[PDB]
Design a protein around this nucleic acid. Sequence first.
DNA 1: TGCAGGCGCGCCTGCA
DNA 2: TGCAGGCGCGCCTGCA
DNA 3: TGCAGGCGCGCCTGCA
DNA 4: TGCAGGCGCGCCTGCA
Lengths: 126, 131
Amino acid sequence: FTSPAVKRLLGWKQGDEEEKWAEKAVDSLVKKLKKKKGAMDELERALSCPGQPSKCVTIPRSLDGRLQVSHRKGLPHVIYCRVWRWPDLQSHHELKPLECCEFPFGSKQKEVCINPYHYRRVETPV
Amino acid sequence: SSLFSFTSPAVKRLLGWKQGDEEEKWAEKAVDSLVKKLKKKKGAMDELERALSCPGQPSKCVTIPRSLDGRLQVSHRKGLPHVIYCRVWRWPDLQSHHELKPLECCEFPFGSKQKEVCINPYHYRRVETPV
DNA sequence: TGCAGGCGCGCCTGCA
DNA sequence: TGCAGGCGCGCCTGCA
DNA sequence: TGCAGGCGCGCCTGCA
DNA sequence: TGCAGGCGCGCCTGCA
Ligand SMILES: [Zn+2]
Ligand SMILES: [Zn+2]
């Protein structure tokens, strides 16, 4: 679609503070996943082919569930579903776990699955 | 390839799967709108690429026609074109035209009330909004 | 050469 | 007086 | 009673 | 071995 001149000019475009923050959040996750054998590999498979079923990609759970990245807090399944699937995701009230997920946020286990393809988008209850 | 600007190859790979929000998608539409205008003028696209490639070197005016209210519409959104393109390539948090002043180098600054308005982001400086 | 659809500038109203 | 947004006629392209 | 944000102690790395 | 600074989870308050 896009012409080669437009792509060239877009490379000079400045990313806003939310885009800069999302890079910080991705880096935070990579430091965690690099420590687990196969984790970075499993996530990349999930992201590359959305139509094919993938395994859980989990991180440790905090007491309130929230994760802090560069002075901002959020729920990690919301954080990474915003990054790779729905940038306009409102809250956790808009997400539901698929049957394949063994560590979904809400299951109250030691680890929480952050694989964006283990959750589906729903309507927030009235 | 810097100290602070550096992203690791793993982060770079994962970031390629990142979805851009509705403002980023809009900014691509705005850039495309400008390229259809500049491709019609001899040397215009070239001067724009020059301006953005080397910010330290002086560039010439890169102008587009001016509308009656000054506003430009791109994909159902309106704004002032010098604000629009200064947000794209220089300051994403730019509030309004009140935060902008033209440099003496600019022959066609917004507010000069001329047929054409300069959209070269390096022909404007960021200032404090008057109270 | 007739349709058919998409979108922006110039118009309009509605606030404060 | 200034902004801010909404919508249509006149423009445009894309077919056959 | 759920969010939301602010900040410090305990952790960590990077020097010499 | 010592310092020096950076940042996050667990704490805290402030609303409705
Ligand atoms: Zn899962
Ligand atoms: Zn100029």
